[PDB]
Amino acid sequence: ALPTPHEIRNHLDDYVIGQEQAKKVLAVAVYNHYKRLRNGDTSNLGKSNILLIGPTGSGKTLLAETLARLLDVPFTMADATTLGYVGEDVENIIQKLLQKCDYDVQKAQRGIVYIDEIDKISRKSRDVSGEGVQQALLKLIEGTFLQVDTSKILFICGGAFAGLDKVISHRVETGSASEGELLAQVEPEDLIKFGLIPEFIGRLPVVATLNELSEEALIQILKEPKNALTKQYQALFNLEGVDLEFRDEALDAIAKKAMARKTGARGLRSIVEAALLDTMYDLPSMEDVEKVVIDESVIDGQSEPLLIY
Amino acid sequence: ALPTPHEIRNHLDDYVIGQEQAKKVLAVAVYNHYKRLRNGDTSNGVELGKSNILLIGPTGSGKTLLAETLARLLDVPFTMADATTLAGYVGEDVENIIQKLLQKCDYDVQKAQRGIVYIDEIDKISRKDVSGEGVQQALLKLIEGTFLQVDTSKILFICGGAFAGLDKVISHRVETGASEGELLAQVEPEDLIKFGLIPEFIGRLPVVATLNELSEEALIQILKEPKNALTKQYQALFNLEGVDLEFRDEALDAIAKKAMARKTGARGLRSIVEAALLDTMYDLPSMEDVEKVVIDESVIDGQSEPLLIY
Amino acid sequence: ALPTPHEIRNHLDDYVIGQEQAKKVLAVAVYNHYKRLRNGDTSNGVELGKSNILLIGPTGSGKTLLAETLARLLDVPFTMADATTLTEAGYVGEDVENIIQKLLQKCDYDVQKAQRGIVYIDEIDKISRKSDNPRDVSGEGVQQALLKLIEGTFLQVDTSKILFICGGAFAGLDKVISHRVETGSASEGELLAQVEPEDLIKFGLIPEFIGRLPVVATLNELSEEALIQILKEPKNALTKQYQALFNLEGVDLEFRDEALDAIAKKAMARKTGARGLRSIVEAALLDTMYDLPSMEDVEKVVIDESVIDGQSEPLLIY
Amino acid sequence: ALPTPHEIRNHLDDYVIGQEQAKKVLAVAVYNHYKRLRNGLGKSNILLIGPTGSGKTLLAETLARLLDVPFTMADATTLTEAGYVGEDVENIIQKLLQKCDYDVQKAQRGIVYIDEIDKISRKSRDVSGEGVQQALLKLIEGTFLQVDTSKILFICGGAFAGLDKVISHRVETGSASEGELLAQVEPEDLIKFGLIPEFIGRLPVVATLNELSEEALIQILKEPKNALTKQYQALFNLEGVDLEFRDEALDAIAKKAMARKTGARGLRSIVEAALLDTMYDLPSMEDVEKVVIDESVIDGQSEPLLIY
Amino acid sequence: ALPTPHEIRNHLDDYVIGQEQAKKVLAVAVYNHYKRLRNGDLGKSNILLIGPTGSGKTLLAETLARLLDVPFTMADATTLTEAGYVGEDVENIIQKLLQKCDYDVQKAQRGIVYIDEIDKISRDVSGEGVQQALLKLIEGTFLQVDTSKILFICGGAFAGLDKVISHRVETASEGELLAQVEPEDLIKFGLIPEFIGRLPVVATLNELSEEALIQILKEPKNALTKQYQALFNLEGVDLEFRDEALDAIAKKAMARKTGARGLRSIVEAALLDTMYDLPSMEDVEKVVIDESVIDGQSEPLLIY
Amino acid sequence: ALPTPHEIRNHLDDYVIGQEQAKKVLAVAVYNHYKRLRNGDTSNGVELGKSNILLIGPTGSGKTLLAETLARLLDVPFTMADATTLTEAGYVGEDVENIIQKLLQKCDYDVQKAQRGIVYIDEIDKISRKSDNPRDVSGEGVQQALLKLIEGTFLQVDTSKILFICGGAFAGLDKVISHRVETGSASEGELLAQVEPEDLIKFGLIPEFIGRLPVVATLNELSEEALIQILKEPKNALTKQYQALFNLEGVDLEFRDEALDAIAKKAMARKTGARGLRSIVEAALLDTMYDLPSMEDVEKVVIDESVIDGQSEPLLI
């Protein structure tokens, strides 16, 4: 029984924060895709391939993985950068999909494939080789000794598209907003000028966009997600018989640190670990009730966490 | 009384926009073909070209429309066929195209010989494999001409194809030390050879027409007529939802215009329709209405939402 | 009853103009090849040449036409192939045998008649792995893979019996020969006559491949006066074909000599040889044929200002 | 029963000298990693940054031994410049299984050390080097062994010669030692060094090693439970002879090692050559003890003192 | 049943003329090589052919294989030089050997490999790379085939070799000088010591005499005259080559410096016209005189 | 009763000329290895060096002869193997254990005596994956597969007990060492003495493999005298090889000492060392082997006059 777009988006809210508009798009795209497969297209339809456009560490990869998990469907990643002999490496993505699929052809067709850094292969001011991948990987999108047809499998292509923000503004301008508002005005002709071939873009009808993560968002990322850092470490300290408490001032402190390093959410973990290193070290050697992390423990990194006996 | 190429092309200007060079070629090719048939080729023993045609142009340029139109202009039985659907048992499916031509011909052997046959996606069968080529040679037997008892020698063959890679092989030859339109004009039989077509097949397609831009009318037809047309596909999607999906003519035309402005051809049609029906499909399973009507304002402007009838 | 080399050449004169030396070579080569087959080579143990041929001539010189004509004159299954479509594959090794299934198909899958068949490989000069015109490892692979055919090995057919004709332009060949034949301090035709297996070696062909092509035929560059003859003399000459087309229109088509020469000059500047003749004539009569049936005149006269110019329209006589 | 970080560090003190801060870090990272696995969260992957012959490799090996866990090494250099090395990246896995008796579960508990990570960094072949950072990146997360590399601990070692500079260009203020500078290391410093953001984000735990002191080299010859002198004293011991290393001789060995820039790795090769002649004509003699002096090491001219 | 060296040399006399010393060496080298393989082993017995271009180096290698019904494959040392990617092209020689071997691992090991123009790779950094890369083959390492069993024959002209030998042997003719060849002479030439040690057996070919070419047209079982006499024979006509004509053919070959390879191209052009109007006549025999070859003016004699 | 390193080297002097420094290292390494085995390493928990050896010397320097001799002097099962026949396979991982079954074969299938055995791996330098002498992925696979043996794991025999001696020429090693030992702006023998584990690293050997070969012996380029022993003593000595060839012909081949010395001198004059020995013997026996399978005699004797002068033919009985 397929989950409605409402249900898919709801389960995406549990793993990904914000990006509500993109999750609406993905929900529909995904739903329609499998809705199409489960009725054998049409007796005697929509490719529904998706194009993720957002900054690095926005959640592009996370969304793809989550979609597959929520639909108990084989999932495999691949990099456009790593892509004549690579034409026989493009089919490699398929064997990997079969590996995680128990070599079940049918389940392999229901699978999802995420290609990262698509904006990197775009030949714009090696070009001849790069375009070669756009056209070689293009043969996959349509669908062709596994014997599996790639027509059935859903393709999700993610990319940062740094220069895309510019080409859009050069078009949308008038006479004389923010990146989020600009990426909404994105059109397939903007991707053309960016470096993507018309035949490739025509194979990616569904276009999703991810907004710039807020500083406050990072704080949410540390708390709200089911696998949020704080929850992960509270679980660790929990099997030690100790309660771990993160003061709001400390969480904000962590976000600020992450912004100063321009590492976004990816740099969150490396900050928390270093802040809890000493504590976890001499933790199994003590006997206290709970440990409370304050701002002074994070930003300054001088004072140790409060210990409650 | 046969229509002059001047008259033929002139009638092609009414169904097809632009493509003036291709229509001139088709006009002469067609005219010569029937001019040869209506004089019994040549008494005794004299040579005469087959006059078969090879349409080379992007998807939604007017290839198919041109073929259909030609037949209507000459009140001649017309039948289509896809090169992709064409195996050894398909060799007996190649003759199927003939029985279909006879069906629309009222089973009149003579009028069937005057008939026109359009084969789409020829560029697809090019082995560049053992089976695909098998069709090139199996269908090759038709071009020459052999229990209908009808000879396919008389019937005109028009092969349409996009030839995506053809634009490259030509540039690798014509180079020295322009646009696709200028490059496709330099097309030579040897370019199709390297592309995947066998020499014996190309030699059977002497007349080569080339289309450049797209045809607004065909783009509209592509959204409707095809068995797997976008509208029909989405009407099927909305149908298993208990809802009827209606595309107003203004909306379809609106969709074509968008596609032309983006120069993405027919390939860019879907991406336009999807974006227009995104919101609707999202909160569709959560509603309870009879049908949804897509107007022009929903496509071009994309501002208003589709009309909902309960 | 096999045709003597005399008869073979004579019939080649009806389809090809000039290249007399080449036609004499092909005549002997072809005759000997089948003369060998129709006597079962040699009983017990004896030697016999493979008799495979290597056509060397400019593009549109008649290489292909010669190969085709040879087959028609001997009512023998004929099939073409491009050496370019072969290079760069080990999966093409199973595509090299494809040429055989083609030969069978046109031969009514007849095993013996397929063995009598003729195979023409075009653009052999393109696969040669050499520093000239810089994949090599893959190209040579074909010289050796297709080499397995030349000798002869689920059709069950042996390619030992079938005649192989390999055509090519060999653009750089004219140079390597001159770097050898030179003395201390003529034309391409005279130079291509001095051709030697070692010249092809330096060009890019492997020794084992050349040794399988003993018979070497050389084609001259079609003369402008020859091209003029091609447009007129042949029974299926272009002018005659187009005069026939204009004829069922009730109109007489006249090609002025100044126009025919103009056509030849156009063909030479394009180096397309005779193969480029049609494409020039068509474009010159294009406009005319378009609005021809719409008119009611007596005859149309093609002048030199209509061909090379492509400007002034053909003279119309009412 | 898992050993506390205290216990892990204690056993590390026995095989490795100094680097107390690094051993504290590794102890935690390791403890947490397995603490996480044994309860069915943080990846806890580690990045060792220290000079050549500082103890990076030794730390990795020791950690595994102390935890009776399958261990395997690999060189990041042998990886770069290939798409066929992507299938060589999984090779590291098959080898981990070989030493694991092909037990999928114990293979997941295993530890993997990648040396010379600083070498693959494409920074001021590049396109190929980065390819490994991302190819080996797929391992870090975890994916016909059927084993998932999500469970296995990854330890990436490197010298990072240029890292000392990029850190100084950031930490500077307006107008200390490498040890103090490597402490100020941040993921953004590695970014500028040539590492991709997605790779560094997979190596959260960062351990920094100091340059082994020349006097530390002397300690390396004495203090460790498996110190060279203790090894050779044992060898000489089952001969009925007592081996005595004079302090002047131990310092002499250290100096030799420094002039050769071979660090601690070059210690053995020096001691062996110094005791080579003695061990040869040892079992043929009958004395009480042999005393190695400086004259026997540096000059190598004089033989070791023999007491009967 | 292995053929004795006597027998091997004998069958070599039928395809190659002169070079009797080289054929005795190759005969022993080959015999021992397979005598070793058929008893499960010892010497590598790899061979180094040293002779001018068109002396018969290649022909000797090919003939040896045919006489022993063993897979044979050629290769050019020049196409190898200047690459580390050619290190994976050195294995190509093996896959080719397997191709002609029907992919039979065992028969591929019995195979023979001839590398031409070895003297060309002699150094520079890239060229030496092949000497050491192709060196790994000589010893013998997804075919799974070991190149230890396969016999290697390395041919070369060694233009400068005649000089280095003279600078040493000094205190006759090239033939006498190439006999005094020593591994140290190849060292100074450009070959690495480790490569030469892998080529123990050294065969030296003489420069084919003018008169030798004459023999080349007659003596060999597949001599041109015999081939064309057979061609004219299935026409009912007897073909006779005058001695003055054969000598005339040899001279032509020398003036063109094409050696024996240029023999055919000379005979063909001389008998071209005759073969053209041969099947159209009815005579007893055709005689080829010198006037028909050298001058190419007069037509061959026709006896009815 | 184990022989002292003194006694071991002394008996090595009877089968090998020169290479005294190498023989001293081998004597100590070997002695220690078995000294450790015969005392069951160490009761409870104590450390002990594996004591595996790495022979580095030119071809025909006696690397193989030293290995074989060591086994004979200690009445211990010995087996050879070529690292070259191993590379390029995962199925060779099951061929790596083959070396063990061969060791058992010569050991009468006695597990214990098999553990005391010695294994010599030749041409180790060949498997090294490096830019020098350009498969790599496959070669390394053996370094790590054979690596599993060094440590020690249907035999049930543990390869931990058996001594491993890996020989190789290491042609490029002489260069990498010079690029390191250099100072600002001697001979190979002096250069190979400066050898370090890091030099083998850059050469193509993995760190984990080298750490398993603690003992490193270096051989010099042999003198003209040693050549005579190389022609006779080694298991696969040329004379034995050709005596075997002549043997399957029903004929006995005898090399007079005067001839053997004659061969050495020839090789010495050409300065090709031991590598040039074969090319000399072949040329001297060429004619004989040619018309040999065609005759019917008892034995052929090679004298000095047949080698040096090359004028007179070998004696036929």
Length of chain C: 318
Distance, in Å, from the CA atom of F126 to the CA atom of F170, rounded to the nearest integer, reads 8
Could you say which DSSP state residue B304 is in?
S
Hey, what CATH topology would domain C221-318 get? Helicase, Ruva Protein; domain 3 (1.10.8)
DSSP state, residue A299:
I
| Min Cα–Cα distance to chain C from E99, Å | 9
F60 is in an annotated binding site: yes
* Residue B94 and residue B155 in contact, taking contact as beta carbons nearer than 8 Å: no
Length of chain E: 304
Reported as type and span, the H/E element at residue B258 is helix B249-261
A261 contacts in chain D (CB < 8 Å): 186-188
Residue type, F196: E
- A142: Cβ–Cβ under 8 A, 6 or more apart, which residues? A150, A151, A203
Contacts of A19 (CB under 8 A, 6+ apart): A54, A58, A59, A63, A210, A211
- The beta-carbon neighbor of D265 closest among F32, F148, F198 is F198
C9 to E276: CB separation less than 8 angstroms, yes or no:
yes
Q: According to the entry, how was the structure determined?
A: X-ray
Cβ atoms of residues D56 and D50 within 8 Å: yes
Cα–Cα–Cα angle for C312, C314, C316, rounded to 5 degrees: 125
State how far the Cα of B159 lies from the Cα of A225, in Å rounded to an integer. Answer: 58
Q: How far apart are CA D33 and CA D55, in angstroms?
A: 21
Which residue type occupies C253?
A: L
Q: Which helix (H) or strand (E) holds B60?
A: none
F67, F118 Cβ separation under 8 angstroms:
yes
Neighboring chain F residues of E39 at a CB cutoff of 8 Å: 248
Q: How far from chain centre, in Å, is Cα A62?
A: 3
Does residue B65 have a known ligand-binding role?
yes
Q: Which residues of E are annotated as a binding site for ATP?
A: 52-59
Cα separation values, E80 from E93, E94, E120, Å:
11, 14, 11
Instruction: Please give the Cα distance from C317 to F24 (Å, whole number).
Output: 114
Here the tokens at position A281 are 């070290």
Burial class from Cβ neighbours inside 10 Å (0-12, 13-18, 19+) for residue E259 reads: buried
Residue numbering of the annotated binding site of E: 52-59
Question: What are all long-range contacts of D141-149, with beta carbons under 8 Å and residues at least 24 apart?
Answer: D141/D202, D143/A100, D144/A99, D145/D93, D145/D94, D145/D97, D145/D104, D145/D107, D146/D104, D147/D93, D147/D97, D147/D104, D147/D107, D147/D108, D148/D108, D149/D93
DSSP state of D146: -
* Residues contacting D177, CB < 8 A, separation 6+: none
Residue D110's nearest CA partner among D143, D63, D157 is D63
**Other C-beta atoms within 10 Å of D52: how many?**
19
| Neighbouring C-beta atoms of residue F119, cutoff 10 Å | 25
How many whole angstroms separate alpha carbon F21 and alpha carbon F27?
A: 10
What 8-state DSSP symbol labels residue F274? G
Pairing relationship of beta strands F315-316 and F299-302 according to DSSP bridges: antiparallel
- Among chain A residues, the shortest Cα distance to D191 is held by A263
Looking at the domain that runs over F221-317, which CATH code has it been given? 1.10.8.60
How many CB atoms are located within 10 Å of the residue A207 CB? 24
d(CA C238, CA C218) in angstroms, rounded, equals 26
Order of strands across the sheet that contains F299-302:
F252-255, F299-302, F315-316
Note every long-range contact of D139-145, with CB atoms under 8 Å and residues 24 or more positions apart, other chains counting. Answer: D139/D89, D139/D92, D140/D43, D140/D45, D140/D199, D140/D202, D140/D203, D141/D202, D143/A100, D144/A99, D145/D93, D145/D94, D145/D97, D145/D104, D145/D107
- Say how far apart CA B94 and CA B152 lie, in whole Å: 11
Count H helices, E strands: chain C?
A: 16, 8
CA C55 to chain CA centroid, Å, is: 8
Domain boundaries, chain D: 1-210, 211-308
d(CA B302, CA B297): 6
Phi-psi label, residue E236: left if phi above 0, alpha if psi -120 to 50, beta otherwise = left
| The residue type at D21 | Q
Q: What is the tally of helices (H) and strands (E) in chain D?
A: 16, 8
- The CATH code that applies to domain D211-308 is 1.10.8.60
Are C26 and C217 spatial neighbours (Cβ–Cβ below 8 Å)? Answer: yes
The answer to whether chain F touches chain A by having 3 or more C-beta pairs less than 8 angstroms apart is no
User: In this structure, are residues D24 and D5 in contact, taking their beta carbons and an 8 Å threshold?
Assistant: yes
CA distance E25 to F286: 7
| Chain A residue nearest residue B273, CA to CA | A205
Going by the DSSP 8-state scheme, the letter that residue C44 receives in this structure is S
Pair E188, E160: CB distance under 8 Å? no
Judging by DSSP bridges, how do beta strands D242-245 and B53-56 pair with one another? Answer: unpaired
Give the distance from residue D201's alpha carbon to the nearest chain A alpha carbon, in angstroms: 5
* A102 → chain D, closest CA residue: D146
- CATH architecture, domain B213-310: Orthogonal Bundle (1.10)
Rounded Cα distance between F172 and A104, Å, is 51
- D267/F214 Cα distance (integer angstroms): 12
Q: Which candidate, A124, A121, A115, places its Cα nearest to that of A81?
A: A121
Is A201 close to B268, i.e. CB distance below 8 A?
yes
| Secondary structure (3-state) at C108 | coil
Q: Are E16 and E59 in contact (CB under 8 A)?
A: yes
Which candidate from C46, C47, C196 shows the least CB-CB separation from E258?
C196
Give, in degrees to the nearest 5, the angle at Cα A279 between A276 and A283.
135
Task: Answer whether B270's CB lies under 8 Å from A207's CB.
Answer: no
CA pair distance E26, E64, nearest whole angstrom: 9
Coil, strand or helix at A271: helix
| 3-class state of residue D242 by DSSP | strand
CB contact under 8 A, A201 and B286: no
Sign of CA dihedral F148, F152, F155, F156: negative
Which candidate, D43, D7, D46, D4, places its Cα nearest to that of D25? Answer: D46
**E1-206 to CATH, choices 3.40.50.970, 2.60.120.380, 3.30.70.260, 3.40.50.300:** 3.40.50.300
Element (H, E) at D29: helix D20-37
Asked if C308 and C265 count as a contact pair (C-beta separation under 8 A), the reply is: yes
Q: DSSP label at C157?
A: -
Shortest CA gap D175–chain F (Å): 36
Q: What is the C-alpha to C-alpha distance for residues B184 and B147, in angstroms, rounded to an integer?
A: 41
Choose which CATH entry (1.10.8.60, 3.30.565.10, 3.40.30.10, 3.80.30.10) describes domain A212-309. 1.10.8.60
- Structure tokens that stand for D145 in this block: 């062994």
Is F285 annotated for ligand binding? no
* CATH code of the domain occupying B1-212: 3.40.50.300
Closest CA to D78 of C113, F204, C305, E94: F204
SS3 assignment for chain E: CCCCHHHHHHHHHCCCCCCHHHHHHHHHHHHHHHHHHCCCCCCCCCEEEECCCCCCHHHHHHHHHHHCCCCEEEEECCCCCCCCCCCCCCCHHHHHHHHCCCCCHHHHHCCEEEEECHHHCCCCHHHHHHHHHHHHHHHCCCCCCCCCCCEEEEEECCCCHHHHHHHHHCCCCHHHHHHCCCHHHHHHHCCCHHHHCCCCEEEECCCCCHHHHHHHHHCCCCCHHHHHHHHHHCCCCEEEECHHHHHHHHHHHHHCCCCCCCHHHHHHHHHHHHHHCCCCCCCCEEEECHHHHCCCCCCCEEEC
Dist CA E152 CA E157 (whole Å): 17
Name the residue of chain E whose CA is nearest to C93's CA.
E99
- Which residues are CB-neighbours of E163 under 8 A, at least 6 positions away? none
Nearest one of A247, A296, A256 to A275, comparing CA atoms: A296
Angle between helices B5-12 and B20-37 (to 10 degrees): 130
Instruction: Give the architecture-level CATH label for domain E207-304.
Output: Orthogonal Bundle (1.10)
Q: Which two tokens stand for residue B212?
A: 């450049």
Find, among C301, C313, C306, C307, the residue nearest to C251 by Cα.
C301
Per-residue DSSP letter, F18 = S
Bridge partners, D292 (sequence order): D245
Residue E60's CB: how many other CB atoms inside 10 A? 24
Token pair of C146, please?
């297709």
Provide Rg for chain C, Cα atoms: 22
At the fourth CATH level, which superfamily is domain C1-220? Answer: P-loop containing nucleotide triphosphate hydrolases (3.40.50.300)
* CA F248 distance to own-chain centroid: 26
b/e C300-312 (16+ beta carbons within 10 angstroms → b): bebbbbbbbeeee
Distance CA F99, CA F112 (A): 16
Cβ distance C28 to E258 less than 8 Å, yes or no, reads no
CA distance A181 to A170: 14
Supply the DSSP symbol for C156: -
CATH superfamily of A1-211: P-loop containing nucleotide triphosphate hydrolases (3.40.50.300)
Residue type at position C103: L
What CATH number has the domain spanning D1-210? 3.40.50.300
Provide φ and ψ at B185, rounded to 5°: -75, -30
Q: Cβ contacts (< 8 Å) between B7 and chain C: which residues?
A: 294
Q: CA triplet C16, C17, C23: central angle to 5 degrees?
A: 65
- Measured CA to CA, the distance from residue C250 to residue B3 in angstroms comes to 16
- Ligand-binding annotation for F113, yes or no, is no
